[PDB]
Amino acid sequence: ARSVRHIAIPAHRGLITDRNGEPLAVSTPVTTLWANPKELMTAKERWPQLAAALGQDTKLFADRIEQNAEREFIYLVRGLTPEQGEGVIALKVPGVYSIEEFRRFYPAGEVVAHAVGFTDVDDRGREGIELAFDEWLAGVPGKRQVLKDRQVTKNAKPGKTLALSIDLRLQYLAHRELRNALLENGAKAGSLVIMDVKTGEILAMTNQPTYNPNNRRNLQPAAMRNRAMIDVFEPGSTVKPFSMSAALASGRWKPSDIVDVYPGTLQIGRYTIRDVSRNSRQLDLTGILIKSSNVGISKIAFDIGAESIYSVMQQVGLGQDTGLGFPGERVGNLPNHRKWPKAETATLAYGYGLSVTAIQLAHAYAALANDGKSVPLSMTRVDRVPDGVQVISPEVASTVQGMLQQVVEAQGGVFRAQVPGYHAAGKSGTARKENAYRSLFAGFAPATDPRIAMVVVIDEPSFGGLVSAPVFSKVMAGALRLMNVPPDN
């Protein structure tokens, strides 16, 4: 006879904003027209008109309805504009019932595709923050009891608003400047991360290529890769500052100390360490960074032991889980030994023989920039800064800052990374993913009182000091002014 069923009341997905309340993802009303074939089978004369008004072809339409003649349920079309929802309801065709639904809209579109991600066909997070805070954002559906035609038991609770760490103004600046860089250098891909060194907040994350999450018809997986969180690479010279941090915490090294790197090579039994530039004998510790001397950093590493270097790299988060619970986040690899031989010691010190993400590197540069105090990474607005872990002594961190300032400013330095108005600090490198090439720059500013850490990755520009550095310069200048950071020069 008659029958009692239940249909679930969809929940309104929580609003996602940038840190200033700029909407980044919004649940917009749509309508999903369904039908009762049993009843539809009674109004076959109306089908061509229905069909046309569903874009569906006349005969393909009717084939469908006939095939499913017995089924009392079938969707016709998911999520139309509520107004086309009338275009069909204006035909009042028997067997045609309708659900009220939400579809996501992304006002900033491609600018913040990866960080925000997108929902699937069921209004479920499938990428980015949409997946990562799916529970917080997805409400709790309600339930209605339906009298099967031959009271609401609990009404739906709405999802909660989420304010991200992203500053949409710095995001636009980063998106633009990394797009321009890729075209000028004719590169395949790239990431740029901007981090608040005090709060752990990700102020900007951008990858190229990007996509419009509002129109994913011709989506490609290369476009959807959140590179900053999933591409792992050997950081090269960009981790030498952590090697130097251990040098200075050893008791055995100070910045004015000299190393002889003549003749730009060093035999390690069978191995040969080889410098990218071999026009040096005596270098101070700053010189070792300015020249990116692998012989220099290797000799210091032999003197202090790999353990001390490995320990700093671990404490600043390299090859460690970020705790950001994003979907396909790669952890990379900070490999350990009982007995570190010379080759493994040297390759760690000059930043081959580990793998890191752009996010991890920026996090580590944040720690150093924050006078050696690690703060947990956040993709949500931080209101109450958690207590940091003091992973490098303030004094060592201060010393390494000044050295990195000289890397950018000193003669022979990475002059294309200077930020006009401010003193900036950082280090270029030439990473490996065969073995792929990326140009890196990693830095923070202002050098004497840091606020912002930044990493730039540029995949196969068809050097870090030549390619990534000028992007760091342009984007840092803008970030600092957008954040009303006072010039320190």
Coordinates of C-alpha atoms in Angstrom, one line a residue:
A1 CA 0.0 0.0 0.0
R2 CA 1.2 3.6 0.9
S3 CA 4.9 3.9 2.2
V4 CA 7.0 6.3 4.5
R5 CA 10.5 7.2 3.4
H6 CA 13.1 10.0 4.2
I7 CA 14.8 12.7 2.0
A8 CA 17.9 14.5 3.5
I9 CA 17.9 18.4 3.6
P10 CA 21.3 19.5 2.2
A11 CA 23.3 21.9 4.5
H12 CA 24.6 25.4 3.4
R13 CA 28.5 25.1 3.1
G14 CA 30.4 27.5 5.4
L15 CA 31.8 30.7 3.7
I16 CA 35.6 30.7 3.2
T17 CA 37.3 34.1 3.4
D18 CA 40.8 35.5 3.2
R19 CA 42.2 36.9 6.5
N20 CA 40.3 40.3 5.9
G21 CA 36.9 38.6 5.2
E22 CA 37.1 38.7 1.3
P23 CA 34.9 35.7 0.3
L24 CA 37.0 33.0 -1.4
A25 CA 34.3 30.3 -1.6
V26 CA 30.4 30.7 -1.4
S27 CA 27.5 28.2 -1.5
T28 CA 25.1 29.7 -4.1
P29 CA 21.5 28.3 -4.4
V30 CA 20.8 26.0 -7.4
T31 CA 18.0 23.5 -8.1
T32 CA 18.4 19.7 -9.1
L33 CA 15.3 18.6 -11.1
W34 CA 14.6 14.9 -10.7
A35 CA 11.6 12.7 -11.9
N36 CA 9.4 9.7 -11.1
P37 CA 9.5 7.6 -14.3
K38 CA 6.3 5.8 -13.3
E39 CA 4.5 9.3 -13.5
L40 CA 6.7 10.6 -16.4
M41 CA 5.5 7.5 -18.4
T42 CA 2.0 9.0 -18.2
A43 CA 3.0 12.3 -20.0
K44 CA 5.1 11.1 -23.0
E45 CA 3.6 13.9 -25.2
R46 CA 5.5 16.5 -23.0
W47 CA 8.9 14.8 -23.2
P48 CA 10.3 16.6 -26.3
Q49 CA 9.6 20.0 -24.6
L50 CA 11.1 18.9 -21.2
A51 CA 14.1 17.4 -23.2
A52 CA 14.9 20.6 -25.2
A53 CA 14.5 22.6 -21.9
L54 CA 17.2 20.2 -20.4
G55 CA 19.6 20.6 -23.3
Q56 CA 19.1 16.8 -23.7
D57 CA 18.4 15.5 -27.3
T58 CA 14.7 14.4 -27.8
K59 CA 15.3 10.6 -28.6
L60 CA 18.3 10.3 -26.1
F61 CA 16.0 11.8 -23.4
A62 CA 13.1 9.3 -24.2
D63 CA 15.5 6.3 -24.4
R64 CA 16.7 7.2 -20.9
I65 CA 13.1 7.6 -19.4
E66 CA 11.9 4.3 -21.0
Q67 CA 15.0 2.2 -19.9
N68 CA 14.3 3.4 -16.2
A69 CA 10.5 3.1 -16.6
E70 CA 10.2 1.0 -13.4
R71 CA 12.6 3.0 -11.1
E72 CA 10.5 5.5 -9.1
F73 CA 13.7 7.6 -8.7
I74 CA 16.1 9.2 -11.3
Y75 CA 17.9 12.6 -11.4
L76 CA 17.2 14.6 -14.6
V77 CA 19.8 17.4 -14.2
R78 CA 21.9 18.5 -11.1
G79 CA 22.2 22.2 -10.0
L80 CA 20.6 24.6 -12.6
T81 CA 20.3 28.3 -11.8
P82 CA 17.1 28.6 -9.7
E83 CA 15.5 30.5 -12.7
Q84 CA 16.0 27.8 -15.3
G85 CA 14.6 25.7 -12.4
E86 CA 11.3 27.5 -13.3
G87 CA 11.9 27.2 -17.1
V88 CA 11.2 23.5 -16.4
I89 CA 8.7 23.9 -13.5
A90 CA 6.8 26.3 -16.0
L91 CA 5.9 23.0 -17.9
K92 CA 4.4 21.5 -14.7
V93 CA 5.2 18.0 -16.4
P94 CA 3.8 15.1 -14.3
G95 CA 6.6 13.0 -12.6
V96 CA 9.0 16.1 -12.4
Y97 CA 9.9 16.9 -8.7
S98 CA 12.8 19.2 -7.7
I99 CA 15.4 19.7 -4.9
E100 CA 16.9 23.0 -3.7
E101 CA 20.8 22.7 -3.5
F102 CA 24.1 24.7 -3.1
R103 CA 26.9 24.8 -5.7
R104 CA 30.3 26.5 -4.8
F105 CA 31.4 29.8 -6.4
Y106 CA 35.1 31.0 -6.1
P107 CA 35.1 34.8 -6.6
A108 CA 39.0 35.0 -6.9
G109 CA 39.0 32.0 -9.3
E110 CA 42.4 30.9 -10.6
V111 CA 44.3 33.4 -8.4
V112 CA 43.8 31.1 -5.3
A113 CA 42.6 27.8 -7.0
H114 CA 45.1 25.5 -5.2
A115 CA 45.0 27.0 -1.6
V116 CA 41.1 27.0 -1.7
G117 CA 40.6 23.9 -3.9
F118 CA 37.0 23.0 -4.9
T119 CA 34.0 20.7 -4.1
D120 CA 32.8 17.6 -6.1
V121 CA 29.2 17.1 -7.6
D122 CA 27.9 16.4 -4.0
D123 CA 29.2 19.7 -2.5
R124 CA 32.1 17.7 -0.9
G125 CA 35.6 19.1 -0.7
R126 CA 37.9 17.4 -3.2
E127 CA 41.0 19.6 -3.1
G128 CA 42.7 22.3 -0.9
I129 CA 41.0 23.8 2.2
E130 CA 37.6 22.6 0.8
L131 CA 38.9 19.0 1.5
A132 CA 41.1 19.8 4.6
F133 CA 38.2 21.6 6.5
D134 CA 35.4 19.6 4.8
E135 CA 34.0 18.7 8.3
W136 CA 34.0 22.3 9.6
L137 CA 32.5 23.7 6.3
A138 CA 30.0 20.9 5.4
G139 CA 27.1 21.4 7.8
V140 CA 24.9 18.4 9.0
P141 CA 22.1 17.5 6.5
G142 CA 18.6 17.5 8.0
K143 CA 15.8 14.8 7.3
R144 CA 12.2 14.9 6.0
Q145 CA 9.7 12.0 6.0
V146 CA 8.0 11.6 2.5
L147 CA 4.7 9.8 1.8
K148 CA 5.6 7.5 -1.2
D149 CA 2.9 8.4 -3.8
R150 CA 2.2 4.8 -5.0
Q151 CA 7.3 16.5 9.4
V152 CA 11.0 17.4 9.2
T153 CA 12.5 15.0 11.8
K154 CA 15.7 17.2 12.3
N155 CA 16.3 20.4 10.3
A156 CA 19.8 20.9 8.7
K157 CA 22.6 22.6 10.7
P158 CA 24.7 25.0 8.4
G159 CA 28.5 24.6 8.0
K160 CA 30.8 27.2 9.7
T161 CA 32.7 30.3 8.2
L162 CA 36.5 29.7 7.9
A163 CA 38.9 32.7 7.6
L164 CA 42.2 31.6 6.0
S165 CA 45.7 33.0 6.6
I166 CA 45.8 34.0 2.9
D167 CA 45.9 37.8 2.2
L168 CA 44.1 38.0 -1.2
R169 CA 46.1 41.3 -1.9
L170 CA 49.5 39.5 -1.5
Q171 CA 48.0 36.4 -3.3
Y172 CA 47.1 38.6 -6.4
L173 CA 50.6 40.2 -6.2
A174 CA 52.3 36.7 -6.0
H175 CA 50.0 35.2 -8.6
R176 CA 50.8 38.0 -11.1
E177 CA 54.6 38.3 -10.5
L178 CA 55.1 34.4 -10.7
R179 CA 53.0 34.3 -14.0
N180 CA 55.2 37.2 -15.5
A181 CA 58.4 35.4 -14.3
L182 CA 57.4 32.1 -16.0
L183 CA 56.7 33.9 -19.3
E184 CA 59.9 36.0 -19.2
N185 CA 62.1 32.9 -18.4
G186 CA 59.8 30.6 -20.5
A187 CA 59.4 28.1 -17.6
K188 CA 56.9 25.1 -17.3
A189 CA 55.8 25.7 -13.7
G190 CA 56.6 27.3 -10.3
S191 CA 55.5 27.9 -6.7
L192 CA 55.7 31.0 -4.4
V193 CA 55.0 30.8 -0.7
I194 CA 54.8 33.9 1.6
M195 CA 54.8 33.3 5.4
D196 CA 54.4 35.6 8.4
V197 CA 57.6 34.7 10.4
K198 CA 55.9 35.5 13.8
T199 CA 52.5 33.7 13.5
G200 CA 53.3 30.8 11.1
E201 CA 50.5 32.1 8.8
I202 CA 50.7 31.4 5.0
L203 CA 49.9 34.8 3.6
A204 CA 50.2 33.7 0.0
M205 CA 50.5 30.3 -1.8
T206 CA 50.4 30.3 -5.6
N207 CA 51.4 27.7 -8.3
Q208 CA 51.7 27.9 -12.1
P209 CA 50.0 26.5 -14.0
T210 CA 46.7 27.3 -12.3
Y211 CA 43.1 26.8 -13.4
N212 CA 39.6 28.4 -12.9
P213 CA 37.9 26.2 -10.3
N214 CA 34.6 27.8 -11.6
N215 CA 35.1 26.0 -15.0
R216 CA 37.0 22.6 -14.8
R217 CA 35.6 21.1 -18.0
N218 CA 39.1 21.1 -19.8
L219 CA 40.8 20.5 -16.4
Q220 CA 44.3 18.9 -16.6
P221 CA 46.1 17.3 -13.6
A222 CA 49.3 19.4 -14.2
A223 CA 47.2 22.5 -13.6
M224 CA 45.6 21.1 -10.4
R225 CA 49.0 20.1 -8.8
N226 CA 49.4 22.2 -5.5
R227 CA 53.2 22.3 -6.3
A228 CA 54.2 24.2 -3.1
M229 CA 52.9 21.2 -1.0
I230 CA 53.5 18.2 -3.2
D231 CA 56.7 18.7 -5.5
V232 CA 59.7 17.5 -3.4
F233 CA 63.2 18.6 -4.4
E234 CA 66.8 18.6 -3.1
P235 CA 67.0 22.2 -1.7
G236 CA 70.7 22.7 -2.6
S237 CA 72.5 25.9 -1.3
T238 CA 69.2 27.2 0.3
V239 CA 69.8 24.9 3.3
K240 CA 73.5 25.9 3.8
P241 CA 72.3 28.6 6.3
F242 CA 71.1 25.7 8.6
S243 CA 74.5 24.0 8.1
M244 CA 76.1 27.4 9.1
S245 CA 73.6 27.6 12.1
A246 CA 75.1 24.3 13.4
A247 CA 78.6 25.6 12.7
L248 CA 78.1 28.6 15.0
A249 CA 76.3 26.6 17.7
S250 CA 79.3 24.2 17.7
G251 CA 81.5 26.6 19.7
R252 CA 84.1 25.9 17.0
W253 CA 83.2 28.5 14.3
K254 CA 82.6 32.3 14.1
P255 CA 81.7 34.4 11.0
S256 CA 85.2 36.0 10.5
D257 CA 86.8 32.5 10.4
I258 CA 88.5 31.6 7.1
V259 CA 88.3 28.4 5.0
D260 CA 90.8 27.6 2.1
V261 CA 88.7 26.3 -0.9
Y262 CA 91.6 26.3 -3.4
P263 CA 91.5 24.9 -5.9
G264 CA 87.6 24.8 -5.9
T265 CA 87.6 21.0 -5.6
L266 CA 88.1 18.6 -2.7
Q267 CA 88.9 14.8 -3.0
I268 CA 86.8 12.7 -0.5
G269 CA 88.7 9.4 -1.1
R270 CA 86.8 8.2 -4.3
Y271 CA 84.4 11.2 -4.3
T272 CA 85.4 14.7 -5.5
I273 CA 83.5 17.8 -4.1
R274 CA 83.4 20.5 -6.8
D275 CA 82.5 24.1 -6.5
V276 CA 80.3 25.9 -9.1
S277 CA 82.9 28.8 -9.1
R278 CA 86.6 28.0 -8.4
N279 CA 88.4 31.5 -8.3
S280 CA 88.9 31.4 -4.5
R281 CA 91.4 30.4 -1.8
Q282 CA 90.5 32.0 1.6
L283 CA 86.8 32.7 2.2
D284 CA 85.1 33.9 5.5
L285 CA 81.9 32.1 6.5
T286 CA 79.8 34.7 4.7
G287 CA 82.0 34.3 1.6
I288 CA 81.3 30.6 1.7
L289 CA 77.5 31.4 1.4
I290 CA 78.1 34.2 -1.2
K291 CA 80.1 31.9 -3.4
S292 CA 77.9 28.9 -2.6
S293 CA 81.3 26.9 -2.0
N294 CA 80.5 23.2 -1.5
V295 CA 84.2 22.7 -0.5
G296 CA 83.9 25.5 2.1
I297 CA 80.7 24.1 3.7
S298 CA 82.0 20.5 3.4
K299 CA 85.2 21.3 5.4
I300 CA 83.1 23.0 8.2
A301 CA 80.7 20.0 8.2
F302 CA 83.7 17.5 8.6
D303 CA 84.8 19.7 11.6
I304 CA 81.4 19.7 13.4
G305 CA 79.9 16.4 12.3
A306 CA 76.7 15.7 10.3
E307 CA 74.7 15.0 13.5
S308 CA 74.7 18.7 14.5
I309 CA 73.6 19.8 10.9
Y310 CA 70.9 17.0 10.6
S311 CA 69.6 18.0 14.1
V312 CA 69.1 21.7 13.0
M313 CA 67.4 20.7 9.7
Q314 CA 65.0 18.4 11.6
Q315 CA 64.2 21.1 14.2
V316 CA 63.3 23.7 11.4
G317 CA 61.0 21.0 9.9
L318 CA 62.8 19.8 6.8
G319 CA 61.6 16.3 5.7
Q320 CA 58.9 16.5 8.5
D321 CA 55.1 16.5 8.3
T322 CA 53.8 20.1 8.4
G323 CA 50.6 19.3 10.4
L324 CA 48.5 21.1 7.7
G325 CA 46.4 17.9 6.9
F326 CA 46.2 18.9 3.1
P327 CA 45.3 16.0 0.9
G328 CA 48.4 15.0 -1.3
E329 CA 51.0 16.8 0.9
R330 CA 54.5 15.3 0.4
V331 CA 56.8 15.0 3.4
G332 CA 60.1 14.6 1.5
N333 CA 63.0 12.8 3.3
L334 CA 65.6 13.9 5.8
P335 CA 67.6 10.7 5.9
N336 CA 69.5 9.6 9.0
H337 CA 72.7 7.5 9.6
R338 CA 74.4 6.0 12.7
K339 CA 77.9 6.6 11.2
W340 CA 77.9 9.6 8.7
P341 CA 80.7 9.1 6.2
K342 CA 82.4 12.2 4.6
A343 CA 80.3 12.0 1.3
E344 CA 76.9 11.8 3.1
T345 CA 78.1 14.5 5.6
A346 CA 79.1 16.9 2.7
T347 CA 76.0 16.3 0.5
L348 CA 73.7 17.0 3.5
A349 CA 75.7 20.2 4.4
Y350 CA 75.3 21.6 0.8
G351 CA 71.7 20.4 0.5
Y352 CA 71.6 17.3 -1.7
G353 CA 70.6 14.0 0.1
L354 CA 67.4 15.4 1.5
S355 CA 64.1 16.3 -0.2
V356 CA 61.8 19.2 0.9
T357 CA 58.7 21.1 -0.3
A358 CA 58.6 24.8 -0.9
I359 CA 56.2 25.1 2.2
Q360 CA 58.9 23.2 4.4
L361 CA 61.7 25.5 3.2
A362 CA 59.7 28.6 3.8
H363 CA 58.7 27.3 7.3
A364 CA 62.5 26.8 8.1
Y365 CA 63.3 30.3 6.7
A366 CA 60.5 31.6 8.9
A367 CA 62.1 30.0 12.0
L368 CA 65.5 31.6 11.3
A369 CA 63.8 34.9 10.4
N370 CA 61.7 34.7 13.7
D371 CA 65.1 34.9 15.7
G372 CA 65.2 31.0 15.6
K373 CA 61.7 30.4 17.1
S374 CA 59.7 27.9 15.1
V375 CA 55.9 28.5 15.0
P376 CA 53.5 25.9 13.6
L377 CA 52.3 26.5 10.0
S378 CA 48.7 27.7 9.7
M379 CA 46.4 28.1 6.6
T380 CA 43.7 29.6 8.9
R381 CA 43.9 33.2 10.4
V382 CA 46.0 33.0 13.6
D383 CA 44.5 35.4 16.3
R384 CA 46.5 33.9 19.3
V385 CA 50.1 33.1 18.3
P386 CA 51.1 29.7 19.9
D387 CA 54.3 29.5 21.9
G388 CA 57.3 28.9 19.6
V389 CA 59.9 26.2 19.8
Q390 CA 63.4 28.0 20.1
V391 CA 65.1 25.6 17.6
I392 CA 68.2 27.9 17.0
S393 CA 69.6 30.3 19.6
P394 CA 68.5 33.9 19.1
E395 CA 72.2 34.9 18.9
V396 CA 73.1 32.3 16.3
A397 CA 69.8 33.2 14.4
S398 CA 70.8 36.9 14.5
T399 CA 74.3 36.1 13.2
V400 CA 73.0 34.0 10.3
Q401 CA 70.5 36.8 9.4
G402 CA 73.3 39.3 9.0
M403 CA 75.3 36.8 6.8
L404 CA 72.2 36.3 4.6
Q405 CA 71.8 40.2 4.4
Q406 CA 75.4 40.3 3.1
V407 CA 74.6 37.5 0.6
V408 CA 72.0 39.9 -0.9
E409 CA 74.0 43.2 -0.5
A410 CA 77.8 42.5 -0.4
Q411 CA 79.9 42.7 -3.6
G412 CA 79.7 39.4 -5.5
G413 CA 76.2 39.0 -3.8
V414 CA 72.7 38.2 -5.2
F415 CA 72.1 41.9 -6.1
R416 CA 68.8 41.0 -8.0
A417 CA 67.2 40.1 -4.6
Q418 CA 67.6 43.5 -3.0
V419 CA 64.2 45.0 -2.1
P420 CA 64.3 48.8 -2.7
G421 CA 63.6 50.6 0.6
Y422 CA 64.3 47.6 2.8
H423 CA 67.3 45.4 3.7
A424 CA 66.5 41.8 2.5
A425 CA 68.3 38.5 3.4
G426 CA 68.3 35.1 1.6
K427 CA 70.0 32.5 -0.5
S428 CA 69.6 31.2 -4.0
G429 CA 70.0 27.5 -5.1
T430 CA 69.7 25.1 -8.0
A431 CA 67.5 22.1 -7.0
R432 CA 67.1 18.6 -8.5
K433 CA 63.7 16.6 -8.6
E434 CA 66.6 11.7 -14.8
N435 CA 67.1 14.8 -12.5
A436 CA 65.1 18.0 -13.2
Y437 CA 66.4 21.6 -12.6
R438 CA 64.5 24.3 -10.6
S439 CA 65.7 27.8 -9.7
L440 CA 65.1 28.6 -5.9
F441 CA 65.3 31.8 -3.8
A442 CA 64.5 31.6 -0.1
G443 CA 64.5 34.8 2.1
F444 CA 62.9 37.1 4.5
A445 CA 62.7 40.9 5.1
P446 CA 63.2 43.3 6.6
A447 CA 66.7 41.8 7.3
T448 CA 67.3 43.6 10.7
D449 CA 63.7 43.0 12.0
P450 CA 62.1 40.3 9.8
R451 CA 58.3 40.0 9.2
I452 CA 57.9 37.8 6.0
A453 CA 59.7 34.7 4.7
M454 CA 59.3 33.9 1.0
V455 CA 60.3 30.9 -1.2
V456 CA 60.2 31.1 -5.1
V457 CA 60.5 27.9 -7.2
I458 CA 60.7 28.2 -11.1
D459 CA 60.8 24.8 -12.9
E460 CA 63.3 24.6 -15.9
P461 CA 63.6 28.3 -17.0
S462 CA 64.2 28.0 -20.8
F463 CA 70.4 30.1 -12.0
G464 CA 68.5 30.8 -8.7
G465 CA 70.4 34.2 -8.4
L466 CA 69.3 35.1 -12.0
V467 CA 65.7 33.6 -12.3
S468 CA 64.0 33.2 -8.8
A469 CA 65.7 36.2 -7.2
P470 CA 64.1 39.1 -9.1
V471 CA 60.6 37.6 -8.4
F472 CA 61.5 37.5 -4.6
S473 CA 62.5 41.3 -5.0
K474 CA 59.3 42.4 -6.7
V475 CA 56.9 40.3 -4.6
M476 CA 58.7 41.1 -1.3
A477 CA 58.6 44.9 -2.0
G478 CA 54.8 44.7 -2.5
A479 CA 54.0 42.3 0.4
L480 CA 55.9 44.6 2.8
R481 CA 54.2 47.8 1.6
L482 CA 50.7 46.0 1.5
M483 CA 51.5 45.1 5.2
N484 CA 52.6 48.7 6.0
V485 CA 56.0 47.4 7.1
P486 CA 58.2 50.5 7.6
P487 CA 61.4 50.7 5.5
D488 CA 64.5 49.7 7.6
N489 CA 66.9 51.7 5.3

